[PDB]
Design a protein around this ligand. Structure first.
Ligand code: NAD
Ligand code: NAD
Ligand code: UGB
Ligand code: UGB
Lengths: 315, 314
């Protein structure tokens, strides 16, 4: 099976390529031109290591600059992870790249997929499409994003439904909830907080720290994502939440990190940022039914891994 | 009160400005870049006519290349109608302008409105956000557009909710259902079919012509749109359908045009355009309560008004 992974040099993409290549039957093409919040210097190593594998090819190009007819001619499955992420940096003059890379890129990929017969077009979306909801959110809820980021990701899901209904492109949408672990982007909370804790710097907390997320450990995320390819169930046209084992507040996380580090952290409480919900909580029942998804990694185990990864990164 | 109308030179915008200027208390600023499917030479007359009114100011500029802080200084109400419209031409490479002018324009306007103190930001959207549903559609239905055009308009709606919830911009979203009448854009069904009938050319039907729309006459649309400004009810944050007096198929409309013209139509049946619903039908319960909205113009009357306009235009 030949698989295209867009955004292959990113946090999730690099882990996904590594996981797919463990199956000797899979061939993977990664495309990435090293934009968004993570500097390229943190991405090249993982790509060089994947390129040692005879079943991996990398294309360092913008999807919008690429001949997508050439790229897709021998592709069975597309994992579409390329995007500009980041709820908090999607305002004002920063918005245009979210539209170009989250909407125009998705449209161009789907147009190119009209001219081939994919098995699956697996589109990665976000809990950010939901906005503020009470209770565990299921995939049938009316989504009302709270951020410009969330809006652009929701437009990407809508484009998938347009091309599925009109042209039978075999879309599947995965909505990830706050993924963490080794290689987590440097703009994300855990990466920042652990880095600050290791440096004996005040921990930057947006608002009062009581906000909660359905944090998804990267290995859980990737097992669900691979299950979207490998399931025997017909999942075409389905939106599927991929969420974590354990929901927690930012204050809860900081306590767990203090127990792991033996540090006593100073807190710097900053003004809450527009665009962010107080709570995310996935109903992952549909993923259980369709993918046999069940997250297995506890926050203490996942935070141990990320702590060791960050400690080594800044050593 | 000073009102900014974006897309003021367009089909709906020019009628809105005309309606607002009838109120001696209202001052109107129109902004329009003369783009989208209607040639500039069909639009410049409406601007010169509105410009006879001392209380109307016209700005011929791209909203994306305008000093918006200066445009919005003295503005109390925004009516945002500027967009690239049209389901059928939103596919392939033609998508790009829909993204710029339906999503980036909306974001840039809302960003400019953050710290000024508007009374209302009245954002115009479309039935195209719904896609295929049976029966009359209400505004609480989960919208899954069928066309890329529909996606871009729903993205603009979602930006309005983002700016409303985070910055208290007082948004109201109106969802229009297939508007027609005098000054209807030349790419829309009635304008094309009338012009063809007048020219004794074959009438282009996409599909078999049994598709129906909730056709909204321009004066009904505008009464609802002005009601969004003038209602005494709190409608901030609401999404409101604006629909028409009666639904009809394209084959029904062709029959009415044959009767108006006294000519027999040669029908040119072309392939269906992807991205179009078979039926549109607004539930206008919410507009009835919040805007006292009731469409009054019969399809017969409205189609005759459009037919006379097209005949005089050409
Ligand atoms: N990290 C999370 O917690 C999280 C949660 C929900 C959803 N997601 C989604 O998961 C995906 C991956 O997120 P991530 O955290 O790995 O982000 P990332 O920034 O690490 O990875 C995305 C990659 O996409 C690439 N990219 C962007 N636009 C491109 C273009 N035009 N052409 C080619 N490459 C392009 C970037 O260079 C980047 O390496 C994104 O779609 C994001 O919206 C992530
Ligand atoms: N005609 C319909 O049936 C209908 C129904 C539902 C929704 N709508 C919506 O109503 C609005 C008006 O549609 P219309 O039929 O009057 O279209 P129109 O094309 O006649 O008018 C839109 C106007 O916006 C202007 N404009 C576009 N982008 C601009 C930019 N960047 N800066 C400045 N001006 C810009 C255009 O020049 C044009 O004159 C649109 O938002 C459309 O999506 C129309
Ligand atoms: O970008 C993305 O791909 C993701 O954006 C959303 O994730 P987020 O919640 O933003 O992740 P994360 O950066 O870990 O912030 C967690 C919390 O810590 C707070 N936070 C953050 C940083 C910091 O220094 N301090 C702090 O308190 C911060 O204010 C927030 O309350 C979606 O939920 C996710 O599905 C995906 O779209
Ligand atoms: O862009 C817009 O602003 C509008 O897009 C949508 O309107 P529509 O229904 O597309 O309008 P309209 O051009 O009158 O086509 C009517 C029918 O005639 C058919 N049609 C059209 C032309 C022709 O020559 N022949 C024909 O059969 C055509 O295939 C279709 O079945 C939204 O509903 C509207 O709210 C608004 O957003």
């Amino acid at each position: 099976m030949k698989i295209l992974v867009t955004g292959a040099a990113g946090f999730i993409g690099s882990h996904l390529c590594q996981a797919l290549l463990k199956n000797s039957a899979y061939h993977v093409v990664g495309i990435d031109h090293f934009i968004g919040p993570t500097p390229a210097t943190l991405k090249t190593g993982n790509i060089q290591s994947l390129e040692l594998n005879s079943r991996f090819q990398f294309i360092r190009e913008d999807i919008l600059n690429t001949d997508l007819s050439k790229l897709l001619q021998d592709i069975d499955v597309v994992y579409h992870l390329a995007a500009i992420p980041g709820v908090r940096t999607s305002w004002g003059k920063d918005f245009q790249p979210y539209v170009t890379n989250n909407i125009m890129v998705t449209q161009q990929l789907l147009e190119a997929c009209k001219h081939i017969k994919l098995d699956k077009f697996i589109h990665i979306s976000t809990s950010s499409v939901y906005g503020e909801k009470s209770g565990a959110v299921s995939e049938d809820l009316l989504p009302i994003p709270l951020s410009p980021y969330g809006v652009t990701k929701l437009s990407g899901e809508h484009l998938c439904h347009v091309y599925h209904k009109n042209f039978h492109i075999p879309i599947v949408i995965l909505r990830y909830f706050t993924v963490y672990g080794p290689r987590q982007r440097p703009d994300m909370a855990f990466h920042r907080l652990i880095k600050q804790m290791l440096e004996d710097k005040p921990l930057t907390i947006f608002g009062d720290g009581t906000q909660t997320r359905d944090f998804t450990y990267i290995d859980d995320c990737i097992r669900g994502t691979v299950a979207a390819l490998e399931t025997k169930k017909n999942i075409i046209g389905e939106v599927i939440n991929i969420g974590g084992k354990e929901q927690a507040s930012i204050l809860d996380i900081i306590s767990m990190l203090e127990k792991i580090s033996g540090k006593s952290a100073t807190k710097n409480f900053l003004k809450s940022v527009p665009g962010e919900p107080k709570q995310t909580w996935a109903d992952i029942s549909k993923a259980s039914t369709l993918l046999q998804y069940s997250p297995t990694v506890s926050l203490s185990d996942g935070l141990e891994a990320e702590y060791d990864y960050i400690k080594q990164l800044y050593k």
